[PDB]
Amino acid sequence: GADREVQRILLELLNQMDGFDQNVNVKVIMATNRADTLDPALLRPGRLDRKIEFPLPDRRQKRLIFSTITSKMNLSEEVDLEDYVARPDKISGADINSICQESGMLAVRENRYIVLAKDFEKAYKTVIKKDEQEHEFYK
Amino acid sequence: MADGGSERADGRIVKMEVDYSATVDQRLPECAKLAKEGRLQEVIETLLSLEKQTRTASDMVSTSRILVAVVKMCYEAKEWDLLNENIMLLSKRRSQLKQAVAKMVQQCCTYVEEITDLPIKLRLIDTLRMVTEGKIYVEIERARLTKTLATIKEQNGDVKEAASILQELQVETYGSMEKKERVEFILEQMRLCLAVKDYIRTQIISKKINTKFFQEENTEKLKLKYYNLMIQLDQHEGSYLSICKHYRAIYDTPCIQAESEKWQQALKSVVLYVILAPFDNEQSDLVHRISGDKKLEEIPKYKD
């Protein structure tokens, strides 16, 4: 008891989604993923049809995201975004936005109106922290 | 102890005004032993303050008796080093050090405006280094500002001089207790930056200038007078409308002063914007406001 309520909810959702000819092209978008718990019932043609992947921003994409985010910025004109674009390590878009935000905060902290390159370097180092604890085992 | 320190100082002042080089390393040991004690803390603080007063005597003898400001650096190093042993959690003896620094600055102003540029430069540098960790209590870094004002006066505000003054007083961040005089010295910062002949870095500083608020209407009008200065500091950087804004601001003073000319000059400033002020709704409203002033029409130029 009290554990099958969620299954009742999912079944109601499946019935509503497929249900009857009440179509009115009411489109649906699901952004919760890592689809292993997803019921095959709510995974099939006629069901949610288009499965579209959102991989980690890769090289040639980190540059696009950097340019787009930094469009409106003071842009000291000495920091070369190419260094970070071609640099290794995996970083997601939220992380890149956070890096830019923190570089800006570091610049403003020292009453520096235009963000300078060392500020960007400091922000990049700060945001990259991986596990940050580990335990020296688990390798 | 209190009696011991008092008798030591009051008796050995005469004994040490004769010796110059070997004199210092006779109070150095007693200073050390006194500092190592912590029985009273507050009273031992007074004893250490008296010892540092004797050190200041050693220093003014050094400036006078022997080569000017040639051993003062050694005194500062000694009273920065021997301090370490009893600055538990960076307390107590630092308070005594700054209590002595009060007299140090009281005599360093005399050094600066009395002695030539070299010894005073060295002394100011040393005391500043001593007070790098020292927070802005009432004058701690204000001493640096005064020294750099001296320098910029001497070499007449070199670009590096303007940079030095602006950075030194920008280090005066929100850590100075005296807000009023802090305003009075950010005033000098604004003056120097405006003197930088940029109007751009002038705008940058104008940022922190606008951060200041209520510079006017302050009790006793002194800040109001300071207000004048900052209102006066506003210039071409202020557009042809803003100039009328700050001129109207200053116009309060001359009516109080009932000046024959400079009050007439203030009225002329607040009326002449119109030619510089392009037409618009608000400009019309404000010209209507200023219009009709009896004191204004006293000038034929108003009629013109």
Binding site: R59, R60, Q61, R63, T68, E77 | -
Partner: protein, 158 residues
């Protein structure tokens, strides 16, 4: 057969010829097929750079988006670095052209100031720089003089 490398190469040649003859959609489809086949198997760096260059060229030609074309050009250039100077110089030229037509002339300077470009600095760089400047001041004549001075600059693309 399974010689997927040659398959990718021929797919890219087909795309290039289709674009030359101006059948854009067919060139796009052939390019996508080449990309899939390349992703399927191993690819040396020159092949990948050439494929990316072709992709950027097609993306620019369709004109629908430019940032993507710019990025593709940049990747093709970086890859062609140290291996294909003849291709790298052209890639830099396309970099400048796309940036200029992005109505952002100013940053062109930074691009020619980039360390990698300096080694490749040459006539074409200054030609594009002056063209960008002419566009910057918004004088039809400035443009015309630049075009007249550098015929070779105008020869490559319409």
């Amino acid at each position: 057969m399974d010689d997927k490398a040659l398959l990718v190469e021929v797919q890219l040649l087909e795309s290039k010829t289709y674009h030359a003859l101006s059948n854009l959609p067919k060139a796009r489809a052939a390019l996508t097929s080449a990309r899939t086949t390349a992703n399927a198997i191993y690819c040396p760096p020159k092949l990948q750079a050439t494929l990316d260059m072709q992709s950027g060229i097609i993306h620019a030609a369709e004109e629908k988006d430019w940032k993507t074309a710019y990025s593709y050009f940049y990747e093709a250039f970086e890859g062609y670095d140290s291996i294909d100077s003849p291709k790298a110089i052209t890639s830099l030229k396309y970099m400048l052209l796309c940036k200029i037509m992005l109505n952002t002339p100013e940053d062109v300077q930074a691009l020619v100031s980039g360390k990698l470009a300096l080694r490749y600095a040459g006539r074409q760089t200054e030609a594009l720089k002056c063209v960008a400047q002419a566009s910057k001041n918004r004088s039809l004549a400035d443009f015309e003089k630049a075009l007249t001075d550098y015929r070779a600059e105008l020869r490559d693309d319409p």
